[PDB]
Amino acid sequence: SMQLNPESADLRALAKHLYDSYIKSFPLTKAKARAILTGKTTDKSPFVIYDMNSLMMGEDKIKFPLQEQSKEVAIRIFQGCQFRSVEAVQEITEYAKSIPGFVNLDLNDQVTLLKYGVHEIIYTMLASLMNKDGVLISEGQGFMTREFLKSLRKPFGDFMEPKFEFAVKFNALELDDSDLAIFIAVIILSGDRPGLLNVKPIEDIQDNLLQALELQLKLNHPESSQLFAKLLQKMTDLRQIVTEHVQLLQVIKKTETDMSLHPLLQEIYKDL
Ligand SMILES: C/C(=C\CC/C(C)=C/CC[C@]1(C)CCc2cc(O)cc(C)c2O1)CC/C=C(\C)C(=O)O
Ligand SMILES: C/C(=C\CC/C(C)=C/CC[C@]1(C)CCc2cc(O)cc(C)c2O1)CC/C=C(\C)C(=O)O
Numbered sequence: 001s002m003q004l005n006p007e008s009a010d011l012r013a014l015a016k017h018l019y020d021s022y023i024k025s026f027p028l029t030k031a032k033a034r035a036i037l038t039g040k041t042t043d044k045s046p047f048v049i050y051d052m053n054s055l056m057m058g059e060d061k062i063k064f065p066l067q068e069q070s071k072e073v074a075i076r077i078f079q080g081c082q083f084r085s086v087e088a089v090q091e092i093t094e095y096a097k098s099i100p101g102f103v104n105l106d107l108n109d110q111v112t113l114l115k116y117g118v119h120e121i122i123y124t125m126l127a128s129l130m131n132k133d134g135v136l137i138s139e140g141q142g143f144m145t146r147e148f149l150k151s152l153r154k155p156f157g158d159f160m161e162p163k164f165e166f167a168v169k170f171n172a173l174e175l176d177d178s179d180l181a182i183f184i185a186v187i188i189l190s191g192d193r194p195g196l197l198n199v200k201p202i203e204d205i206q207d208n209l210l211q212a213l214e215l216q217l218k219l220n221h222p223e224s225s226q227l228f229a230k231l232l233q234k235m236t237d238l239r240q241i242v243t244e245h246v247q248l249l250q251v252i253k254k255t256e257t258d259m260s261l262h263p264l265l266q267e268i269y270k271d272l
Pocket of ligand 1: 026027028029077078080082084085087091119122123125126128129139159163249265
């Protein structure tokens with residue numbers, strides 16, 4: 001069974017390092033998101049976008065567009081989501097640099113792990129900002145309803161729904177930021193990504209993160225012995241969400257020309 005030894009003290013040290021770096025890299029933590037979503041925050045309520053009227057009032061309220069603002073609502077929303085995804089790529093990149101051993105990997109491998117990892121991490125962390133009713137946007141200053149997003153014309157009405165479906169089930173696991181910091185690191189350090197140069201050093205880092213994660217979960221969740229196994233299952237699930245997402249982006253690229261795909265996202269999508 002579980003032991004207090006030097007190995008376990010090192011794994012707890014790693015968990016703390018990752019948590020501290022995760023806090024630094026991602027201002028809106030799950031703890032803060034949940035406080036807003038339950039109202040248990042003392043902060044001002046987010047502005048709620050639940051219909052076309054409150055979307056347009058929202059554009060006046062929420063600050064975070066030359067011929068962008070000429071496009072129909074669904075495209076303005078979709079383009080906004082793309083920009084926020086690119087900001088998320090930047091943050092997740094900075095987080096990865098804090099993962100011990102990551103910056104010592106060959107720079108091409110660092111880039112490959114991020115290329116194939118970032119969307120998995122985006123869907124994981126998006127769950128922190130979701131409840132069954134909607135999602136927090138612009139770092140908690142807004143809340144956009146799930147049914148409002150579904151109401152957008154085909155094919156835009158379907159692009160968030162699979163992320164909500166993932167989030168309701170993921171959120172039932174009741175992970176906290178301390179758990180997530182390690183989970184995200186595990187996903188990034190996946191040795192099976194296409195086109196990696198040096199698989200073994202990545203596998204060696206991931207093995208240590210997986211040990212850190214299993215110990216964190218045993219300590220932090222006395223009421224489930226299944227949680228580690230369930231989280232390995234979520235890692236495979238996320239690869240499905242991303243596949244499905246990419247196919248939707250194809251359908252959009254094919255059917256919905258006169259609508260710009262962010263060049264950086266194009267680069268990432270190339271070989272997913
Ligand atoms: C999934 C999505 C938007 C990502 C929105 C988003 C910001 C997700 C990441 C959530 C985290 C990582 C949570 C923590 C956090 C804290 C911050 O302080 C700031 C941000 C951005 C943040 O983002 C729309 C569909 C994808 C598109 C168009 C694409 O890809 O084609
Ligand atoms: C659903 C989603 C982003 C909506 C992005 C959005 C506000 C789209 C609407 C864009 C338009 C129609 C265009 C101009 C504009 C500017 C604003 O400043 C505010 C709004 C509402 C706005 O609306 C992904 C999750 C985002 C997170 C966590 C975040 O961390 O964001």
